[PDB]
Amino acid sequence: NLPEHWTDMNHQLFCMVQLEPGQSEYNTIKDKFTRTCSSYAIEKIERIQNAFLWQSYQVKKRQMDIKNDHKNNERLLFHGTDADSVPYVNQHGFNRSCVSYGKGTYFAVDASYSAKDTYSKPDSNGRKHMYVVRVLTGVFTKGRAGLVTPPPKNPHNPTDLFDSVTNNTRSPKLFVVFFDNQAYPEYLITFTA
Amino acid sequence: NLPEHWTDMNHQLFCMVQLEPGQSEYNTIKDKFTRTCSSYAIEKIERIQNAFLWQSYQVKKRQMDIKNDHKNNERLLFHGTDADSVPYVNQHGFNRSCAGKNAVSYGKGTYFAVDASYSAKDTYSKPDSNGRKHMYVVRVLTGVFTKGRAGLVTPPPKNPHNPTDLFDSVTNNTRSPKLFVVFFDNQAYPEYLITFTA
Ligand SMILES: Cc1cc(C)c2c(c1)sc1nncn12
């Protein structure tokens, strides 16, 4: 079933819902962004209500919670993208087919890393786009150029994989996931430098 | 929600089940195969019982069944692979990031053949050191499809002015399909593994 904080979708399966500034949900997401991006200007925040992406994500979450025998497999991370990818992500999520720690989709711990113009490319009017993403990072190891999946947890058990890779395991600043339904885009932040 | 005909797996999540010649299950697969591969001989057929792959597959099938207009979204297709790939496929399914370039490319995804003869070629089902060839029988969510193009990394849109409303798969020929390409995870469930030889 669809999370409690969602709003009614009149029997539809997809909706982008603008948050009211100063209400609790808006303040919580705004604070995560302004922790490292307080010099920027927030035009709006939208909640992504994608029923199909949510269902597929929650399945993979239940599966990861069984496989790893604990429930700290999920992290809140950031993803900067160009305005032309936004409609695709809203509808179909992150696609690795669209890379120094591997050929997957990249998420940042800090909004400031996602805020770089090379990730959240400014459009004509200077508008920049960053997602807040639920990511199933699960059990992770250091990444390396050319990975197509995470490496195995043991060379003698070649099909038992890590869930994600990172730049640095003691102190991660990015995570790379290699499979379709391992990230759910929860909020879109429209903002300017 | 695991199928009732599956072997009980105690509390384990994966099992390869050897089928018995003379079973309807084994004979329907042998028939589908020998229809185009009458010169080869089947060593065995195993049923792939992968709980996790099955769940994620059945969620995608329910979504495509809701999305499309009462369509028949699922076809049973073949996929020849090398011995080295078989443990990965059994466990994790078909990964487009690992796919070969096909000799006639209609997109960058995972390829599935209508006819066992196509999959039976040494280019796909590479003979192992003991001369065994491997081909999967695969449930594929082909849905609504179009003729693909070598450049595709996702299916094309139905309508260029609505870029995110996609076809489900592509084919070589919409009038006589012989290949399908899929571009997403959990859109194909590997149901049976056929081991065979010349
Ligand atoms: C190396 C790398 C590549 C990308 C694409 C990336 C990051 C780091 S952090 C971030 N936020 N959105 C996108 N990205």
UniProtKB/Swiss-Prot annotation, chain B:
Compartments where found: Nucleus
Start and end residues of each PARP catalytic domain: 2-198
Family affiliation: Belongs to the ARTD/PARP family.
Purpose of the protein: Mono-ADP-ribosyltransferase that mediates mono-ADP-ribosylation of target proteins. Acts as a negative regulator of transcription.
Name assigned to this protein: Protein mono-ADP-ribosyltransferase PARP15
Name of the coding gene: PARP15
Residues of the full protein shown: 481 to 678 of 678
